[PDB]
Design a protein around this nucleic acid. Sequence first.
RNA 1: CCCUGGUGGUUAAAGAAAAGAGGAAACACCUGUUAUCAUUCCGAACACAGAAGUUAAGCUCUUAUUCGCUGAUGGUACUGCGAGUUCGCGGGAGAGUAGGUUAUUGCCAGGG
RNA 2: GGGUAGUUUGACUGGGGCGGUCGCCUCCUAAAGAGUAACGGAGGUGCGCAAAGGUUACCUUAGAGUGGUUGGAAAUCACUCUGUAAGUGUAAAGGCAUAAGGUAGCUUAACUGUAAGACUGACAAGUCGAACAGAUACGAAAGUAGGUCUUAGUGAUCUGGCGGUGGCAAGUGGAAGCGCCGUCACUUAACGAAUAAAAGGUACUCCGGGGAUAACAGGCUUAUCCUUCCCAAGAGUUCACAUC
RNA 3: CGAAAUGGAUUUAAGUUCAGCCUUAUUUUAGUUUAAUAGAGGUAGAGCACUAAUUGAGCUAGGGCCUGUCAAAGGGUACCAAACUCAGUUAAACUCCGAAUGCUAUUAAAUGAUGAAUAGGAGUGAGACUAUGGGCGAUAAGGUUCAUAGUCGAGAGGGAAACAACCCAGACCAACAGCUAAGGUCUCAAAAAUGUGUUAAGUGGAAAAGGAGGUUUAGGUACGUAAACAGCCAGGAGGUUGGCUUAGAAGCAGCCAUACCUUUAAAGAGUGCGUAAUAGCUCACUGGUCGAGUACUUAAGCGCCGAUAAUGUAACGGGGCUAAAC
Lengths: 119, 74, 138, 50
Amino acid sequence: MKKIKEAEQRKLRRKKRIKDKIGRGVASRPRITVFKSNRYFYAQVIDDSKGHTIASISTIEKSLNLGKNIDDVKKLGEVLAKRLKEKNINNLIFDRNGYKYHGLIASFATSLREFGINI
Amino acid sequence: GSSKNGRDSISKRLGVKRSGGQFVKAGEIIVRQRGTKFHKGKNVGLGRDYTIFALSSGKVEFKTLKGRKYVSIV
Amino acid sequence: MLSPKKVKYRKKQRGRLSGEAQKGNKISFGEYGLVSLETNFITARQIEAARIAMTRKIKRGGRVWIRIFPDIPYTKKPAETRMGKGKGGVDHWNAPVKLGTVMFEMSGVVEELAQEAMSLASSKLPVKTMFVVRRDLR
Amino acid sequence: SLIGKLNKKVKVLKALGLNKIGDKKVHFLNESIKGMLNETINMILLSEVM
RNA sequence: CCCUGGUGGUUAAAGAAAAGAGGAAACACCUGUUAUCAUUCCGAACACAGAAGUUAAGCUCUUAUUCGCUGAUGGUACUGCGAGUUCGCGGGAGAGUAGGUUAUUGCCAGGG
RNA sequence: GGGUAGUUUGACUGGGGCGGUCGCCUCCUAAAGAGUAACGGAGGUGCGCAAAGGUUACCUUAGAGUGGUUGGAAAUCACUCUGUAAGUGUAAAGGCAUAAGGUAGCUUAACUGUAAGACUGACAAGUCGAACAGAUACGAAAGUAGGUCUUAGUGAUCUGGCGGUGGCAAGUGGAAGCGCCGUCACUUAACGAAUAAAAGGUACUCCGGGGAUAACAGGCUUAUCCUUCCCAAGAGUUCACAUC
RNA sequence: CGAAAUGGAUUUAAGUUCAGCCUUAUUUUAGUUUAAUAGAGGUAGAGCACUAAUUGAGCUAGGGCCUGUCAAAGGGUACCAAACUCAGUUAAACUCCGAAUGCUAUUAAAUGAUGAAUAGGAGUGAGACUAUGGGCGAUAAGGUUCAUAGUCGAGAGGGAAACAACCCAGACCAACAGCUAAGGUCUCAAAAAUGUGUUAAGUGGAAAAGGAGGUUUAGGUACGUAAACAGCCAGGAGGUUGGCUUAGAAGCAGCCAUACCUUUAAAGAGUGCGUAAUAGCUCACUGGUCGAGUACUUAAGCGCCGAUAAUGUAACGGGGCUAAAC
């Protein structure tokens, strides 16, 4: 009850502070946010001048058939990079979205980095 | 038995310097205050002493959200 | 006496008191009330003089409620001084009353005896008064 | 007269165009003139121009 | 499209409490601490590795509005001005009363 | 070394003296922009911190109730309700849940040259500031940092000391010295600071003026004073009003 | 054409200087008041949601009192009373709320040089009262200190009998012309008559707490042609010295109620007078003679008393006025 509620509350507070520390995204340099469920892994690129998701990816996508490991998110970030290049976006701001930059997120981010995306 | 007190500081001239709807250019001071009596919205910045100033030319506007006042340049 | 037992500040500025009463203007705890017809200050000590009068007139018949409490210092400079130093010192306590304040309330006794007792009280206050029955019960 | 009246009202009357007693001015009633006339109603006499 | 999840926009609480309903997918609970990682002790949280089990809680929806929040119309206080004087013109609360309220919506992903 | 000489010995002030006060900061007075006086009402201050500064990341008090070795009203531990009432070096106010509060890691931006545009303002001054070049700290990055949550902890000019630079160098070349940059020494507190250097008496007094200002009278006021009057608990053998 | 007596600083407070206000010259054109739209307050007011003060009940920790008491665990709680609940108040340094005016921006009209910049020359830096909001004082001062506006200052004329600051109104000069503002229209003294009421105090032509069968109008509660009230004629009692305290208290020192009954027409544990104590005289109470409003109150319009100093009527300017007052 109260313990789960306060865990949620802490997550929200962290999320909000992160958001206004990094600022909003613009069509030139939109914002990349992630979400880490118990099963999957989601990423969205958002332009807040419109509230529009320019691109997105997740491990639910059957064709990718990745898992939920460091290796899998490496490949997933590769796919995201190749999907964004054809929509000619190279600058992104990395909203860690209430998580700690470590492990899976670290591998995701570095994978977007080796392939010419400025985060 | 004289007066034990009688001591006052110099008035600091706080308050809103540009009224909502006025046209300002970059760098104008909008509010002088102690503390965020008014908070910062789009296109404004907060000085080290909570002064509100305009980052770009535009028109001042005040909004209210959950009872807090926000200053913006639109 | 009647007086507050602790104050934030010992001395306060004499305002201008005006207008009728918009609150504390209805009979609440009793049967008969002693409304005022003026706006003025009632000292604590006149308050207790009126209270003695009412209570003594009432041979245990009922209860008396006092609807005002002074809580306002009244300062007075020493006897022989000039206009120099400032805000001399508290002397006695005043309560504020406006036209329509109930000011006193009584319970238990027959209406005639209450009216007599409460004229006996009004004889010692500095304001015109009026004795009111509930005017919506009997 | 304008002597002794409030400063704001003297300004309103000079904005209407009246400086002396016996001053004659024709004006077209819109909201502005209506507001000025309401401000200074006690010092004017209004007749209508058929 | 609808459901679910994520992420915004518009501010009136979009607030908590109790009762009931579900859970395909999705979300969450949940399982182990062994690898990198974390706590001024604790794998609780954070972090990594996963699919044995469940709506119990979180979550969504439905309830008497139970608490809160919001709240008219009139009247009063107050008030600008006035050769009408407790009067003439204009503005008009707070409290209370009748009520109301358990949000709405943009585009991304999954499958209906 | 008052034997002698030249002088100083503040102002505000419900007359002057005595007393108190003099700069700066917070609130009220202040009449809902700013400003606004009194010997009006309450306080603080002439600092502290090598972190109590910078940044990254993570956490949330106090109170009430409840179960507990000493342990008691109250120490530490756990839960429920309450939801900032706690806590922010230091007064008060304005702020502070994204916390500006608490903890830990690293660290020195407690930087050089600048600065569009402003606020406040007699002047002198004071205050905010995006952004740019150099070079760092933290961070994966975006970005933040030109001391401290904000507003008090301060002192002009002249004179002199210290370090740097190498501009001026009285015929020339040096040098003394000066200028420039960095910086130190003033309860100059009477705090916009008359001097580097300053107390009293005059009824022996003198001069220039003032009813701008006191003592005697007139005037305004009536606290105080005096004269009444309203209420009548009572005293008076009973009987408030013969009387008090 | 036309100020200022303010702000800042000062070995300054009766001085001086800068700003503010004035004038001349040139340039510039955009003050000022509305209306509409849109903004930030925290004042008046209000409120108890915060910080404090505070009223009466309800509840109840804790503290003592008492009691099966040791000082074990206890119980009766008049109380001393935290917290909490309901109802009701106070605040410049309280605010969950919150105006009106005022302030700022834009636009459109309206007013016509009232704005601003540069330069030459200043003066002023002692203010006063009146209408509001305040602080100090004693909600005293023609007091002192601030804010807004006005007047005087620097303003003549008319009115308030006289009376710089109040009311009306801004004097270029002349006229033996008219209409009006304030204020007036019996007379001094230029100007009024009519309509409906009120006032008996010359109120008008000073004032309080309080007293008050003054009167006009309006409205309640008692009470009444089935007899009210005042008077007049009767009863106004029996039980019962109500039990008593006391010495007595017989209705009338004093305690208690008089849920004390009967004959009841009506008679009270008596209204007053007065007796040591009664005794005694009266009243409420009720009956007959009479014959309609009466008895207590409420709101207004005028009045009454309270009313009260010293050269001389002297608180209408005078004469006077019953309107020539309201």
